[PDB]
Amino acid sequence: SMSVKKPKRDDSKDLALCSMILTEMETHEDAWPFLLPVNLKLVPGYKKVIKKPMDFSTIREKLSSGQYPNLETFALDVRLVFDNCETFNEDDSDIGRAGHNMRKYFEKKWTDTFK
């Protein structure tokens, strides 16, 4: 509360470390469904059904331009990519499996870097 603060967690490396995690996600062999925005002209249903589209390239641009106020807002966009994937794709599809694999990969890197 006013003039009463918990001890200052060092956040000065967070930008660098989110960039490294994002690099690792970009270079994973199962990243291909997620590298670019879904083409809303060419994929029936996507525009209407997925209210907040997100992809790695869009997270990368946001990251590079100071659009994440903190590391939690970065984790929310990454998770959004996988939550959108599960909303639109059957679990038993190459893309559905890709999304599950990538979410697991991400959550381990997140825990090991920050928790």
Side-chain angles (χ1 to χ4, degrees), residues 1-7 9-12 14-114:
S1 74
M2 196 189 324
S3 309
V4 181
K5 283 308 161 332
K6 288 206 191 53
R9 193 209 160 246
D10 183 10
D11 65 341
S12 55
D14 288 358
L15 188 61
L17 291 159
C18 289
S19 177
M20 290 171 57
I21 291 170
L22 183 56
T23 291
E24 296 162 358
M25 280 193 312
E26 289 162 338
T27 59
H28 193 299
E29 61 161 300
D30 301 339
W32 58 265
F34 318 111
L35 292 176
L36 297 178
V38 175
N39 186 334
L40 300 183
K41 298 168 195 305
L42 306 182
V43 180
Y46 208 86
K47 193 176 202 291
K48 186 62 178 280
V49 169
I50 301 296
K51 302 312 185 168
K52 291 171 72 169
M54 186 53 59
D55 67 285
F56 297 170
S57 81
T58 302
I59 299 168
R60 173 66 75 193
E61 181 61 34
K62 279 180 76 168
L63 197 65
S64 295
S65 56
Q67 290 188 66
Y68 296 116
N70 55 60
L71 86 168
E72 302 304 334
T73 58
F74 169 82
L76 285 170
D77 268 353
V78 178
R79 291 167 182 148
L80 178 57
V81 171
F82 309 127
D83 294 345
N84 290 346
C85 186
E86 279 195 54
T87 291
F88 207 84
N89 292 268
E90 277 293 343
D91 295 341
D92 189 8
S93 69
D94 298 274
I95 293 171
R97 279 188 285 281
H100 291 290
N101 285 354
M102 294 301 300
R103 180 197 302 274
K104 186 88 176 174
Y105 191 69
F106 168 67
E107 292 305 347
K108 170 100 157 70
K109 305 281 184 182
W110 190 252
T111 293
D112 294 351
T113 304
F114 293 118

PDB file of all heavy atoms in Angstrom, residues 37-54 84 87-88:
ATOM      1  N   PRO A  37       0.458 -14.578 -39.233  1.00  0.00           N
ATOM      2  CA  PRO A  37      -0.989 -14.478 -39.028  1.00  0.00           C
ATOM      3  C   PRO A  37      -1.805 -15.368 -39.972  1.00  0.00           C
ATOM      4  O   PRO A  37      -1.363 -15.599 -41.121  1.00  0.00           O
ATOM      5  CB  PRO A  37      -1.329 -13.028 -39.349  1.00  0.00           C
ATOM      6  CG  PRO A  37      -0.077 -12.339 -39.587  1.00  0.00           C
ATOM      7  CD  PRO A  37       1.048 -13.309 -39.716  1.00  0.00           C
ATOM      8  N   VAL A  38      -2.824 -16.009 -39.430  1.00  0.00           N
ATOM      9  CA  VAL A  38      -3.759 -16.816 -40.238  1.00  0.00           C
ATOM     10  C   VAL A  38      -4.350 -15.890 -41.290  1.00  0.00           C
ATOM     11  O   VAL A  38      -4.690 -14.725 -40.933  1.00  0.00           O
ATOM     12  CB  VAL A  38      -4.838 -17.458 -39.408  1.00  0.00           C
ATOM     13  CG1 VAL A  38      -5.897 -18.199 -40.309  1.00  0.00           C
ATOM     14  CG2 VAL A  38      -4.194 -18.477 -38.450  1.00  0.00           C
ATOM     15  N   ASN A  39      -4.406 -16.377 -42.555  1.00  0.00           N
ATOM     16  CA  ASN A  39      -4.904 -15.521 -43.657  1.00  0.00           C
ATOM     17  C   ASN A  39      -6.468 -15.494 -43.590  1.00  0.00           C
ATOM     18  O   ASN A  39      -7.130 -16.489 -43.838  1.00  0.00           O
ATOM     19  CB  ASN A  39      -4.353 -15.991 -45.069  1.00  0.00           C
ATOM     20  CG  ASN A  39      -4.740 -15.036 -46.206  1.00  0.00           C
ATOM     21  OD1 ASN A  39      -5.760 -14.319 -46.137  1.00  0.00           O
ATOM     22  ND2 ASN A  39      -3.904 -14.991 -47.245  1.00  0.00           N
ATOM     23  N   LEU A  40      -6.973 -14.378 -43.104  1.00  0.00           N
ATOM     24  CA  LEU A  40      -8.414 -14.210 -42.879  1.00  0.00           C
ATOM     25  C   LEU A  40      -9.255 -14.145 -44.132  1.00  0.00           C
ATOM     26  O   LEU A  40     -10.478 -14.376 -44.050  1.00  0.00           O
ATOM     27  CB  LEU A  40      -8.691 -12.975 -42.011  1.00  0.00           C
ATOM     28  CG  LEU A  40      -8.053 -12.951 -40.581  1.00  0.00           C
ATOM     29  CD1 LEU A  40      -8.448 -11.706 -39.784  1.00  0.00           C
ATOM     30  CD2 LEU A  40      -8.396 -14.217 -39.782  1.00  0.00           C
ATOM     31  N   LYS A  41      -8.641 -13.879 -45.289  1.00  0.00           N
ATOM     32  CA  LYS A  41      -9.350 -13.988 -46.577  1.00  0.00           C
ATOM     33  C   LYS A  41      -9.461 -15.438 -47.018  1.00  0.00           C
ATOM     34  O   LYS A  41     -10.430 -15.787 -47.662  1.00  0.00           O
ATOM     35  CB  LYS A  41      -8.645 -13.231 -47.714  1.00  0.00           C
ATOM     36  CG  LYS A  41      -8.493 -11.726 -47.573  1.00  0.00           C
ATOM     37  CD  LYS A  41      -7.509 -11.251 -48.671  1.00  0.00           C
ATOM     38  CE  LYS A  41      -6.957  -9.841 -48.479  1.00  0.00           C
ATOM     39  NZ  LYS A  41      -8.039  -8.825 -48.347  1.00  0.00           N
ATOM     40  N   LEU A  42      -8.490 -16.281 -46.674  1.00  0.00           N
ATOM     41  CA  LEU A  42      -8.439 -17.614 -47.215  1.00  0.00           C
ATOM     42  C   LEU A  42      -8.837 -18.708 -46.310  1.00  0.00           C
ATOM     43  O   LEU A  42      -8.825 -19.853 -46.772  1.00  0.00           O
ATOM     44  CB  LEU A  42      -7.037 -17.927 -47.769  1.00  0.00           C
ATOM     45  CG  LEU A  42      -6.499 -16.902 -48.803  1.00  0.00           C
ATOM     46  CD1 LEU A  42      -5.140 -17.419 -49.244  1.00  0.00           C
ATOM     47  CD2 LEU A  42      -7.437 -16.590 -49.996  1.00  0.00           C
ATOM     48  N   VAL A  43      -9.186 -18.429 -45.033  1.00  0.00           N
ATOM     49  CA  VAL A  43      -9.533 -19.511 -44.092  1.00  0.00           C
ATOM     50  C   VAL A  43     -10.911 -19.207 -43.604  1.00  0.00           C
ATOM     51  O   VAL A  43     -11.136 -18.301 -42.760  1.00  0.00           O
ATOM     52  CB  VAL A  43      -8.523 -19.709 -42.930  1.00  0.00           C
ATOM     53  CG1 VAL A  43      -8.927 -20.831 -42.014  1.00  0.00           C
ATOM     54  CG2 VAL A  43      -7.120 -19.978 -43.488  1.00  0.00           C
ATOM     55  N   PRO A  44     -11.895 -19.897 -44.225  1.00  0.00           N
ATOM     56  CA  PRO A  44     -13.285 -19.743 -43.780  1.00  0.00           C
ATOM     57  C   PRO A  44     -13.456 -19.974 -42.303  1.00  0.00           C
ATOM     58  O   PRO A  44     -12.908 -20.929 -41.723  1.00  0.00           O
ATOM     59  CB  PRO A  44     -14.034 -20.860 -44.582  1.00  0.00           C
ATOM     60  CG  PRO A  44     -13.250 -20.975 -45.863  1.00  0.00           C
ATOM     61  CD  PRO A  44     -11.807 -20.629 -45.514  1.00  0.00           C
ATOM     62  N   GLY A  45     -14.262 -19.133 -41.697  1.00  0.00           N
ATOM     63  CA  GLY A  45     -14.624 -19.284 -40.280  1.00  0.00           C
ATOM     64  C   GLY A  45     -13.715 -18.534 -39.316  1.00  0.00           C
ATOM     65  O   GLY A  45     -14.172 -18.066 -38.232  1.00  0.00           O
ATOM     66  N   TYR A  46     -12.467 -18.286 -39.738  1.00  0.00           N
ATOM     67  CA  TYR A  46     -11.445 -17.830 -38.736  1.00  0.00           C
ATOM     68  C   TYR A  46     -11.713 -16.479 -38.193  1.00  0.00           C
ATOM     69  O   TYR A  46     -11.709 -16.264 -36.932  1.00  0.00           O
ATOM     70  CB  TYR A  46      -9.997 -17.911 -39.276  1.00  0.00           C
ATOM     71  CG  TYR A  46      -8.988 -18.114 -38.133  1.00  0.00           C
ATOM     72  CD1 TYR A  46      -8.696 -19.372 -37.670  1.00  0.00           C
ATOM     73  CD2 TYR A  46      -8.346 -17.042 -37.522  1.00  0.00           C
ATOM     74  CE1 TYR A  46      -7.765 -19.566 -36.624  1.00  0.00           C
ATOM     75  CE2 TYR A  46      -7.342 -17.229 -36.532  1.00  0.00           C
ATOM     76  CZ  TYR A  46      -7.071 -18.487 -36.056  1.00  0.00           C
ATOM     77  OH  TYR A  46      -6.161 -18.712 -35.002  1.00  0.00           O
ATOM     78  N   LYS A  47     -12.042 -15.576 -39.110  1.00  0.00           N
ATOM     79  CA  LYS A  47     -12.302 -14.198 -38.730  1.00  0.00           C
ATOM     80  C   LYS A  47     -13.432 -14.089 -37.704  1.00  0.00           C
ATOM     81  O   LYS A  47     -13.317 -13.407 -36.690  1.00  0.00           O
ATOM     82  CB  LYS A  47     -12.583 -13.327 -39.962  1.00  0.00           C
ATOM     83  CG  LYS A  47     -12.553 -11.819 -39.686  1.00  0.00           C
ATOM     84  CD  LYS A  47     -12.735 -11.000 -40.957  1.00  0.00           C
ATOM     85  CE  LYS A  47     -12.210  -9.572 -40.857  1.00  0.00           C
ATOM     86  NZ  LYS A  47     -13.029  -8.750 -39.942  1.00  0.00           N
ATOM     87  N   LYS A  48     -14.525 -14.792 -37.960  1.00  0.00           N
ATOM     88  CA  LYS A  48     -15.690 -14.729 -37.031  1.00  0.00           C
ATOM     89  C   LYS A  48     -15.525 -15.446 -35.710  1.00  0.00           C
ATOM     90  O   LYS A  48     -16.075 -15.087 -34.653  1.00  0.00           O
ATOM     91  CB  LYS A  48     -16.960 -15.320 -37.784  1.00  0.00           C
ATOM     92  CG  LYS A  48     -18.281 -15.200 -37.029  1.00  0.00           C
ATOM     93  CD  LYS A  48     -18.646 -13.741 -36.774  1.00  0.00           C
ATOM     94  CE  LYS A  48     -19.989 -13.601 -36.065  1.00  0.00           C
ATOM     95  NZ  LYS A  48     -21.105 -13.730 -36.993  1.00  0.00           N
ATOM     96  N   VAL A  49     -14.865 -16.580 -35.772  1.00  0.00           N
ATOM     97  CA  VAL A  49     -14.779 -17.405 -34.615  1.00  0.00           C
ATOM     98  C   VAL A  49     -13.679 -16.954 -33.647  1.00  0.00           C
ATOM     99  O   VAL A  49     -13.881 -17.036 -32.420  1.00  0.00           O
ATOM    100  CB  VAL A  49     -14.532 -18.889 -35.041  1.00  0.00           C
ATOM    101  CG1 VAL A  49     -14.164 -19.759 -33.837  1.00  0.00           C
ATOM    102  CG2 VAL A  49     -15.790 -19.407 -35.784  1.00  0.00           C
ATOM    103  N   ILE A  50     -12.542 -16.502 -34.166  1.00  0.00           N
ATOM    104  CA  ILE A  50     -11.330 -16.237 -33.280  1.00  0.00           C
ATOM    105  C   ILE A  50     -11.260 -14.758 -33.052  1.00  0.00           C
ATOM    106  O   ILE A  50     -10.877 -14.008 -33.973  1.00  0.00           O
ATOM    107  CB  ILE A  50      -9.997 -16.722 -33.921  1.00  0.00           C
ATOM    108  CG1 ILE A  50     -10.096 -18.238 -34.191  1.00  0.00           C
ATOM    109  CG2 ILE A  50      -8.786 -16.330 -32.948  1.00  0.00           C
ATOM    110  CD1 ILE A  50     -10.235 -19.058 -32.923  1.00  0.00           C
ATOM    111  N   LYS A  51     -11.717 -14.336 -31.892  1.00  0.00           N
ATOM    112  CA  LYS A  51     -11.913 -12.911 -31.663  1.00  0.00           C
ATOM    113  C   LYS A  51     -10.579 -12.122 -31.558  1.00  0.00           C
ATOM    114  O   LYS A  51     -10.527 -10.937 -31.908  1.00  0.00           O
ATOM    115  CB  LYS A  51     -12.751 -12.685 -30.368  1.00  0.00           C
ATOM    116  CG  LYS A  51     -14.140 -13.370 -30.361  1.00  0.00           C
ATOM    117  CD  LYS A  51     -14.931 -13.121 -31.662  1.00  0.00           C
ATOM    118  CE  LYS A  51     -16.332 -13.710 -31.554  1.00  0.00           C
ATOM    119  NZ  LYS A  51     -17.179 -13.221 -32.690  1.00  0.00           N
ATOM    120  N   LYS A  52      -9.509 -12.792 -31.108  1.00  0.00           N
ATOM    121  CA  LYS A  52      -8.224 -12.148 -30.950  1.00  0.00           C
ATOM    122  C   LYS A  52      -7.111 -13.025 -31.581  1.00  0.00           C
ATOM    123  O   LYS A  52      -6.489 -13.822 -30.889  1.00  0.00           O
ATOM    124  CB  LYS A  52      -7.954 -11.938 -29.497  1.00  0.00           C
ATOM    125  CG  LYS A  52      -8.887 -10.886 -28.882  1.00  0.00           C
ATOM    126  CD  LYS A  52      -8.759 -10.819 -27.354  1.00  0.00           C
ATOM    127  CE  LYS A  52      -7.438 -10.168 -26.925  1.00  0.00           C
ATOM    128  NZ  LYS A  52      -7.447  -9.874 -25.454  1.00  0.00           N
ATOM    129  N   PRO A  53      -6.909 -12.886 -32.863  1.00  0.00           N
ATOM    130  CA  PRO A  53      -5.843 -13.684 -33.568  1.00  0.00           C
ATOM    131  C   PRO A  53      -4.468 -13.270 -33.006  1.00  0.00           C
ATOM    132  O   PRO A  53      -4.276 -12.110 -32.604  1.00  0.00           O
ATOM    133  CB  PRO A  53      -5.975 -13.285 -35.017  1.00  0.00           C
ATOM    134  CG  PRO A  53      -7.392 -12.801 -35.141  1.00  0.00           C
ATOM    135  CD  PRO A  53      -7.808 -12.224 -33.822  1.00  0.00           C
ATOM    136  N   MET A  54      -3.580 -14.252 -32.884  1.00  0.00           N
ATOM    137  CA  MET A  54      -2.188 -13.944 -32.471  1.00  0.00           C
ATOM    138  C   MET A  54      -1.258 -14.978 -33.089  1.00  0.00           C
ATOM    139  O   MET A  54      -1.721 -16.138 -33.362  1.00  0.00           O
ATOM    140  CB  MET A  54      -2.132 -13.882 -30.937  1.00  0.00           C
ATOM    141  CG  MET A  54      -0.802 -13.442 -30.361  1.00  0.00           C
ATOM    142  SD  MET A  54      -0.178 -11.844 -31.061  1.00  0.00           S
ATOM    143  CE  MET A  54      -1.580 -10.833 -30.584  1.00  0.00           C
ATOM    144  N   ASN A  84      -6.137 -20.204 -29.187  1.00  0.00           N
ATOM    145  CA  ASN A  84      -6.757 -20.084 -30.514  1.00  0.00           C
ATOM    146  C   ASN A  84      -6.644 -21.376 -31.359  1.00  0.00           C
ATOM    147  O   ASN A  84      -7.623 -21.806 -32.021  1.00  0.00           O
ATOM    148  CB  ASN A  84      -6.149 -18.941 -31.331  1.00  0.00           C
ATOM    149  CG  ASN A  84      -6.508 -17.569 -30.812  1.00  0.00           C
ATOM    150  OD1 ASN A  84      -7.405 -17.405 -29.993  1.00  0.00           O
ATOM    151  ND2 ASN A  84      -5.797 -16.532 -31.328  1.00  0.00           N
ATOM    152  N   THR A  87      -9.055 -23.934 -30.100  1.00  0.00           N
ATOM    153  CA  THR A  87     -10.415 -23.538 -30.470  1.00  0.00           C
ATOM    154  C   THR A  87     -10.796 -23.956 -31.932  1.00  0.00           C
ATOM    155  O   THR A  87     -11.927 -24.373 -32.233  1.00  0.00           O
ATOM    156  CB  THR A  87     -10.675 -22.020 -30.303  1.00  0.00           C
ATOM    157  OG1 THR A  87     -10.676 -21.703 -28.920  1.00  0.00           O
ATOM    158  CG2 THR A  87     -12.119 -21.597 -30.848  1.00  0.00           C
ATOM    159  N   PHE A  88      -9.847 -23.860 -32.823  1.00  0.00           N
ATOM    160  CA  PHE A  88     -10.107 -24.055 -34.238  1.00  0.00           C
ATOM    161  C   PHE A  88      -9.701 -25.402 -34.831  1.00  0.00           C
ATOM    162  O   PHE A  88     -10.124 -25.701 -35.963  1.00  0.00           O
ATOM    163  CB  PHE A  88      -9.505 -22.869 -35.021  1.00  0.00           C
ATOM    164  CG  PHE A  88     -10.184 -22.564 -36.333  1.00  0.00           C
ATOM    165  CD1 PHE A  88     -11.333 -21.764 -36.369  1.00  0.00           C
ATOM    166  CD2 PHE A  88      -9.640 -22.992 -37.528  1.00  0.00           C
ATOM    167  CE1 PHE A  88     -11.970 -21.458 -37.575  1.00  0.00           C
ATOM    168  CE2 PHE A  88     -10.228 -22.661 -38.755  1.00  0.00           C
ATOM    169  CZ  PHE A  88     -11.380 -21.899 -38.787  1.00  0.00           C
TER     170      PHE A  88
END
